[PDB]
Amino acid sequence: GQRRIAIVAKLTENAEMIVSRAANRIFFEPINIARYGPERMQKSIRDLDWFLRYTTYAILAGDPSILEANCLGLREILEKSCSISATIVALLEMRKNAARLFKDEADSKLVSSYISVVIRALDADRSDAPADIVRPSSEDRPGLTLPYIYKLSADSLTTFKMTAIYGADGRPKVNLSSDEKERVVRAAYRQVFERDLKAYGQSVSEAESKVKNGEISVREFVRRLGKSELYRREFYQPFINSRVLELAFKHFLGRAPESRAEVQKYFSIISSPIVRGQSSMPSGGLYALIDALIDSEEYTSIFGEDTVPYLRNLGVEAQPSW
């Protein structure tokens, strides 16, 4: 960072010149200053400085992402407004400027790499750049779509998953480092119970054993947690039934309950006296609630069988206003 600061300082003082040469070059196809008009020219001047100011920031930051997010959509925005080529030609000048300012090859190179990111998006088509997913809903909760650059700006989400591996034996065996296996389990425990249950030093013995071996899935593990004695009494038993279904939303699906009709459907599940079940595993009741959530397509699709549920949040999946 310290030398990166020095690199930034050098770039800062020569920045106005660096911009000028890129601008003089373009002001491929060459476009005259006058036909563009002052405002469009003024914008173009601003834009050059804009790329450069982010570059300085990106140096200090030491991440491609800051430049990455802004450049993506920008290329789409530009086109009717601007020639794609002129923007490119500009960096040709500024990378040459960059090489001149910093005599250390590496110092010029890193500065080049930031400028490379900006260019690489511009080079990539509007189509080549990918639109971010849109969270889907059934008959309630309208479907919301999130922009990708928004998703990129947001800090990456750590996903804990353990995948069952087929064997020659035909009994699944799962390969992970000693720390790595059990880390998924550590986070699962933590998501469902909302705190890590090791500091209390109880956890279902047989649950986790089966997932370590890999025969019952992580999806089936989180199922086993909800049904577990630990999960009630910690949750369920201290709350009224209407509050339990709201917490059970948060930890099992990562969203809050989104509509009146769903909190009603779920309230009837937990309320309903069980149909008598042959499985000694107690029939429905609150267990029904937990089933209905894991068995839900929304659950299975977003998380899949391997992933442990994660909390969807501002960064991911948009998040609704109502």
């Binding site: 849109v134 889907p136 809903s137 059934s138 008959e139 309208p142 479907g143 919301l144 779509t145």
Partner: protein
């Protein structure tokens, strides 16, 4: 209603309404005027439909209006007829809506539970609805009757 259903599917998909979906809406709005007339006819004949259906039901099921039976006594018999009237009103609502959803929310969800607490026999109620259908069909023209029949059938199926 038809329109609500279409909008809801679009919103789930997070898309503007498809041409095909739009076409169905167009068809529905054209049908509506005919539907309104069918509904109007049944409303005017409502009093007689209920009366005729009631008599048929009581002939079909002597037991319900018998000392053991739930319907027995003037108060109880009135309530049974009131129920028939309710279902007829729901059917009219359905015809204008073009969907069973209006009917379904008001009358078909929790119906089993309500009647079981009351101890009213569900099959008898179904027979009454069938009876009402027959009376209604006679007053309606054939094509009109077919439209009305669908809604009547749904009710019978639901109970």
């Amino acid at each position: 209603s038809v329109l609500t259903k279409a909008i809801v599917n679009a919103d789930a998909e997070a898309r503007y309404l498809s041409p095909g979906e739009l076409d169905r809406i167009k068809s529905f709005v054209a049908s509506g005027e005919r539907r309104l007339r069918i509904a109007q006819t049944l409303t005017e004949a409502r009093e007689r439909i209920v009366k005729q259906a009631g008599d048929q039901l009581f002939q079909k099921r002597p037991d319900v209006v018998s000392p053991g039976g739930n319907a027995y006594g003037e108060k109880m018999t009135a309530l049974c007829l009131r129920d028939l009237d309710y279902y007829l009103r729901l059917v009219t609502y359905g015809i204008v809506a073009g969907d069973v959803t209006p009917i379904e929310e008001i009358g078909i969800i929790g119906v089993k539970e309500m009647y079981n607490s009351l101890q009213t026999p569900i099959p008898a109620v179904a027979e009454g609805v069938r009876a009402m259908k027959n009376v209604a069909t006679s007053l309606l023209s054939g094509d009109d009757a077919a439209e009305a029949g669908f809604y009547f059938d749904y009710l019978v199926g639901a109970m």
